[PDB]
Amino acid sequence: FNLDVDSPAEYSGPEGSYFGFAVDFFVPSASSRMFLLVGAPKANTTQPGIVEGGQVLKCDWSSTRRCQPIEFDATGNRDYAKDDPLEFKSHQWFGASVRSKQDKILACAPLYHWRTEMKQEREPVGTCFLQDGTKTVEYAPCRSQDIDADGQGFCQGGFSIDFTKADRVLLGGPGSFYWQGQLISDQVAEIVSKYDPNVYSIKYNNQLATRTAQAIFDDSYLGYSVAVGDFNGDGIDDFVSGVPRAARTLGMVYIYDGKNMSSLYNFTGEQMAAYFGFSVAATDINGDDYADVFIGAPLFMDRGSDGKLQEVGQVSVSLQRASGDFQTTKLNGFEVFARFGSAIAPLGDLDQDGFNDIAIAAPYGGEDKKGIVYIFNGRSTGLNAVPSQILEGQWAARSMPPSFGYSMKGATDIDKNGYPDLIVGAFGVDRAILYRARPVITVNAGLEVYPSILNQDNKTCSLPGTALKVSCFNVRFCLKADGKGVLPRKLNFQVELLLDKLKQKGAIRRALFLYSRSPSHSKNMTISRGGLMQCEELIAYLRDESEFRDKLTPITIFMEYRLDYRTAADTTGLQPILNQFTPANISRQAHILLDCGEDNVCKPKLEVSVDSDQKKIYIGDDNPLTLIVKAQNQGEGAYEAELIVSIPLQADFIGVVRNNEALARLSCAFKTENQTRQVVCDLGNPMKAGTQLLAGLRFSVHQQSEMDTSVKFDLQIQSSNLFDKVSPVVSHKVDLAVLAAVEIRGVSSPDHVFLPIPNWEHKENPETEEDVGPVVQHIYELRNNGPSSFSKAMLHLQWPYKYNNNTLLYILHYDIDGPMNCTSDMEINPLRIKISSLDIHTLGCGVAQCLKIVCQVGRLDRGKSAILYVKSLLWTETFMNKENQNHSYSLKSSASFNVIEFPYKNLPIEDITNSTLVTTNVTWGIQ
Template structure:
C-alpha cells in the first residue's frame, strides 16, 4: 500500500494543479477529547518490522491518576485507515508523591505530559515540561519538568533537570538506574554545554533542537535555537556531537523576529551533506506600500564539501501577515522521488479564518525551490483554541516500506492523508513525412476515388512507477491536428478514418514495459479550402491516466509525475514553391498615385487612389494590401468600371482603433505578379486644424522572411471653396392703381388703412462645397421720396442663423400688425393682384425710385455658419403708402420701387487653410406700381365646353373600334 500522511487537521489543495502526490481527496480523521490538545506532539512508532503506529500527545487530557487534573497523556493510534482507533499508553498511573500527608513532593496536575513525544525502535520517550517539584527544606515549587521512557513493558522516569544533569546518551543506563524511590539519580555518561554567565539568562537556549552531521566525522552534531540571544536578534548554535564544543553560530538580522524559533537539518541539494534550515516566524518585510509587515521567514544554509556553509543564505518569506510562517519546519524525505529531499514549512495562523497552512517545498541541485509545489490548508476550526494547523510536524519516515516517506501535520484535531504513488510517463509522437506535398495525392478519401495528400501519425506511451500499481495502466489519449488554429477556424488536416481533426481512444500500457505504439493516417485538405499555407501544422497529443482502473484495493489513486509534461507535439510543413529550402522570400513593392492633388472640404466627389502592387521575389502567401484610412476619410469601394484596374476583394475593418482597408492580393501572390487597383474614398475635415489627409499603404504576407513591403504614403491637401449666392423676389411684383373702393385716412390705424401688402424676400444660399462661418448681409430699402412715404415696413422676419439690426425704427407709427400673416402669394381682402395688365397707357412713363433717388432705410445682418446647401432668409413685410401715389401730381404715372442687398463672406470655419478672396455679391428686388384699369378675368362660353366634350367621346369610340378589329385579326391567326 502507499505511504500515509497524518494531518491532525484535514489538508486541502489551495491552488488546483499545483499540488503533487498527496491524497487530499479522502483524508482519514482522528480526534481526541475536547480541550485535550490532542495532536500537540506526534511521532511514528514501529516497535517491530510488522507493526506501525502513530504516537499522539494530548498534554491537557485528563487521566486516571488519583488527584491529578489534566495530567496529560500519550495515545497510540493504529495508522491503518480501516482501523483508526487510539488507545492511551500508561506511563505513570500514580498521583503526586508526598513527604507527608498534605505535604506533596511533586505536582503532576497541569504538567503537560505529552507535550513532546519521540520514539526509536520499541522505545518511547514522552515529557511533561511543566512538571513541578520541591525539596523538603524549601517550600518553593520548581518547574523542572520530567520525562518517561517506555520500553514496551515498563515505564522509567527520567528527570535530568531534577538531578542537575542535562543529557544522558545511553538509554540502557536510564533503564538500569531507574528507581521510583530515588528522585535525584546520578548518571555516569552525560553531555552538557558549558555554563554561561548571567548575561545569557532568558536567551532560551534549547528552544528548538535538531541533529545532523556538520563535522564530516559520521557523528551527529546538535543544533539548538536560541531565539532571544544577541539582544533579541536570535541565534542558532551547532555543538559537536562528541564533545559539545561550539562549532558554528548563526545570528539573526532583525530584532524580535524570533530567529531560531524552529530548526531543521536535512540534505536538500543531494550532495550528501546536511543542510540547515532556521525559522523566524516574527520576521517583518516591507510590503508594496513600504510598510513593515510580519510575514515570517526561513533561512536556508547549504553545507559545503570543504566544511562550513555558503556565505549567502537563501531566504523564503511568508505569504500572509501574522500567519507565523516557519513556526515549524520538518524534513520530508524525497517526497516526489526526484533524488532531492523536500521540506514542509507551517504557517499555523494563515489561510481562511486563520485555520493554518502548510507549504511543501521541493529540493533541487541548487538548493530549495523558491516557490511551494503544494499548499495545504486546515478546514476545521476548534472551539477552545486557535486551529493552528501544522503547529508541529514530523516526517521523513517510510511507514509502509513502499518507497514514499510519510509526514505528520498536527493540531488538536486529527486526520491523515496518504502519499499517492507517482507514475512517470514517457510519450512519443512521430509525423511522417514532415514536409507535406499537396500535389502528391496518393490516398483515396472516399468511395468516389477522390485523391488526397496523406501523412502518418504514430503515437506511443510508456509508464512506470513505485508503490502499489496494477500490472496494466490505462490512459485516455487524444490527438488533435492543427492544434494552433483558433477555435472555429478551418483545420488544414484531418484524420482519414473519421474526417475529423480529433481522435480519442483509451490505450493500455504495461507498467514498466516497452513503448506501446499505434499509427493513424491523416490527410491534407485541398488548398482551395484554406488560406494559410506557411505556418506549420501542429500535431498535438495529450494523455490522462484513468485513475479508477489504477487505484489500489483501499481506493488510493496514483498520480502522474508533475515534472513530466502530459502532452507532446510535433510539426509538419506544407511544401511550397520556394526553392530547395522550402522558404519563400518575396520582394513586395507598392506605389500609389491620384489625379487629385487637393480636395475641397465638403466636396462629395470621391478621391480615387490608384494602387500598384508588385512582387519581385518568391511567392508571398496570404498577401494583402493594408491601407491605413485617416480619420478624415471613409472607404467607399473599389473602381469597377475600368478594364485596366483589377477588381480586388477589399474589406474595411478596425484593429486597435486603427481604421484599415484590407485587400486580398492572392494566396500566393506569385513571383512577378503586378496588380493595379483603384480605391474610392470620401474625404472630410475631422478637425478645424486639419490641412491635409494622409494615407499609408503596405503589403503584408504571412511569410517568415521579407513579409512586408516598405510603407508608401500619399498625401492630398485640403482646400476651401464656397459658392455663395443671393436671390430676391417681390410678392407681388406688380400693383395696379387706383384701388377700387379705397379711401385714405388721415391717421391710419391698421395695415389695410395704409395700402396693399408688399413683401421682399432675400435668400442667401451656400452652394458649397465648403462651409462658411460668418457673412455680412446689408440691405437698403426705399423708404421716402420728397418726404412722402413709399414702402412702410411693418416688420421683418429671419429664417436660419442670422441676426439683424436697422438704422431706423421699424413701424414708428405703431400701426397694428395683422395677427394672421398674409402669404407671399396672397394680398389683402380687397385683392389688388391681377394676372394680366393693360400697360398701353403708361408703358413709357416709369420712374425708378431706388436708393440713388429715394431716402433708404438700412438693415445690417450677420449670418452664422452655413453648411453646404444651407440657406438664410430675410422676409421684409411692408405696405404701399397708397396716399402718396394717389396725389394728383403722381397719378397716371408708373413707378419702379427697388430694394437692394449685398453680402460679403468674412470667415470660414477652417484654421491653417488659405481663404478664398472676395466672396461677395449683390441683387436688386423690384416692385412695379402701374396706373391703369385692372382687366376682368376672361371667361369661356358654355357652347365651347359642350363641343369639347362631344369631340372627346367621338375619339374614344374610334379607339375602341380600332382595338376590337386588331384583336380579331390576331385571334384568326
C-alpha cells in the same frame, strides 16, 4: 510535490486535551505494522488526584482510527512527609514533547513541579518517561540536588527532545540556571540501566551537558527547540538548539559537538523579538549528504511592497559547504499574522527523486486562521523556494485557533506505497491528520507524421465514401511511462489528436483524418513498462486545392493525454500523479509543398553577421551590450527558421529592440535546456527566399574578474529542411577593458586657526598638547569609484614640518583605514608629547623642509577607499608678532598617488596618477 488531500486520515481527542500538540510516527522493530503517536498535554487521567496530567496516544493506521493512550505511569503524587507531597503531576503538560525510535519512545512533562527535599517548594524541573514495551523508566536529568532558579529548579527539561542514530537522547531545559537554558545528552540503557525507583536524582555516567554561563546570558532560552545532525567532521549527530531570546531578543542557534558537547557553530537573528529559534530542523535537502540547517523566526517582520513593516515570518536555510561554512539563504512567509517558520518538518522524499523535501507551517493562515502547510522540494542547487503544494486546515475554531500545523511530523512510509507521509496537528480542535504521499509517474510522449512536407498533387489513398485518391500522410504517437514505487501494471491513458491547431474558430481546417473526416480524433491506449512504448498509428488526408487558401501556415498536429483512477492501490485507491514538470502536450508541424521548385526539396542558403559595434566592455559594472544581427535566406523555403545566439555565463538577454525604426521585433526568447544558455528567435516559419532580417539583441555583461580577455557569442540559423538546414556558425567576441577612476580628496579639521591664540604660555620644554598649540588635523582619502579594481598603488604625502630650523605643525601620529601601511622618513612625535594629562604667505614643502609619509596601498575595489588621518599641533612659534609680515602664513600639505598594479594582466592596463593639497591658514584675525 504531491500527496493525497482528497482522503487523508483524521484523528481526534478530548475537548481541550490539546490532542495533536506533539506528533510522531511509531515504527516497532518487533512488528510488521506502524502507528501514530499523538500527545494530549491537557488530557485528564486516572492517576489519583491528578488533573490534566496529560497523555500520549498510539493511534492505529489500520484504517480503524482508534487511539487508546499508552501506559507510561498511572501513580499519583509521591510523598516526602505526611500531608506533604514530593511532586505534583497535575497540569504537567505530559505529552508536550514526543519522540521515538524502534520500540523506544520518550515522552516528557515540562510543567512537572517538584518540591525540593530541602525546603517546601513547587519548582518546574520537568521529567520524561522512556517506555520500551514493558520496561518504563522515568528520565529527569534536571531533578538534581542543585536547586532553585540559580540552578536547575526551573529547568522544565523535556521542553524539546530528540534521539541521535547511535541511540542517545538530547534534551532541552530552557529555564536552567537563570533561564539561559541547557542541553543534556544521555545514552539510553544508561538511562534504562540506572533507573532506581528509590532515588530522585540519579547520576548518569557518560552524560553530556552545557554549563552555567555568565549573568549576561540569562533569559536566553537555550533548549526552546532541538534538532540533530552531523556537521562537525564525521561520525555522529551533533547538537542543534534554538535560543530564541539570545543576544538582545535577536535570537541565536547553537551547534554542539555530539561527544565533547563543545560549541561548533552559531547563528544569529537579524531582527529582534522575531523569535529566531522557535523551531530548528536539520536535513540534507540537496543530496550531497550534508545536514543543512533550517531555522524559524515566525514573528519576522519583512518590508512589504509599500515599505511598511509586516509580521509574516521567515525561515533561515543554511546549506552546509564541505569546508564547514554555510551558504545561508532566506525565505519569507505569505500572509501576515499567520506564523511561518513556526514548524519546519523535513519530509523524506515525498516525490522520491533523490532529493529530500520539507514542510514549513503557517498555523494561523488561510481563511479564519485555520492554518496552512507548505511543502518545499529539494534540488541539486538547494531548496526550490516556491511551495510545491499547500495543505489547508478544514476545522473551525472552538474556543481558540485550531492551530493546524503547529506540530507536524513526516518521514516514515506508514503505508504500503513507496513514498513518505506526514502527520499534522491541529490542537485548537484536538486533531491529527495523515496525509499519504501518492505514486508519481513520469511519462514520455512521441508524435511524428510521415510525409512531413505535404504534396497537393499526390495520388495515394481514397476517401471513405468515394474511392477518390487523395494526398496522404500518416501520423503515429508513442507513449511510455514508468514510476518508482507501488503503482504499475495498468497505466491507462486518454490520448487526443488534433489536426491544424493553428487554425482557430475560423474553421479552415486544411487537414482531416481518414475514415472519420474531421481534424479531431479520440483514442485511449495503455502501457506499464519503462521501455515498452506502445504506439498507435493513423492516416490523414489533405483537402483539395479548391477548398481553401493556406499560404503555408504549417499544419500542426497536436497531442494531449492524461491519467485515470482505478490504477491505484487497494487501501483507499491511492491515485497517482504525473510528474510536476512534464507537459501533456506535444505537437509537430506539416508543410504543403510550395515554391520548392522541381527537386521538391526546399534547400535554402542561410547567413548571419554581426558588426562588432562598441568594441569594449569594462570589468566591474554591468556593461550594456546590443548586437546587430543580419540574418537572411538566399535559398528557398526555410521551415521553422530560427536564430541561435550562444551566450556565456554572464551574458543575460534583456530583450529585442523596439526603440529603432530600422530594426525588427523578432519573437526572441531565452533558453537553457542543456548545459548551455542561449537565445532563439523566430525568423518566420517559412522564412521565404531572399528574406533579409537585421535586428538588435541587447544584453548586460556581468564581469567574472580576470577570466581571460574577451567574450564570445555564437550565431547561427537552423531550420527543418532535410537539406542545407543550417547556417555557418558565426562567432563574435568583444574585448574586456580596464577602468578605475581613482581620486584623492583631502581636508583640514581646523582649516583656519586664528593666531591671536586664546590662552597660551611659552613653556621652556613642552610636555602636553596644550603647552604646544591647537590640533590641526589633515585627512587624505584615496578612493576608487571606477568599475575595475586595482591591486596596488603608491601614496606620497609631503608635510610642512619646519621653516628655517623652526617647527610648524608637529605631527603627533597618524591613523589608517583600509588597505594601506605607511612610513615617515622622520620619527613622528619625537618630543614624546601626550594628550591632556589632567614666504609672504604660502608655506608647506618646496619652501619648508619636509617630513614625508610614504604609504603602500593595495586592494581598492569598485567602491572602496583608503584614508590617512594626520594629527598635528600648530607649533605656536608662528608668532614673531614684532617686526614685519608675521601677519599671515598658509601651511601647505600635499599628497599624491600612483596606481602601479591591477589583478588583470591580460588587458592593457595603464597607470593612474594625480595629487591634491590641504591648507591650514594661520592668520591674525583682530590685529
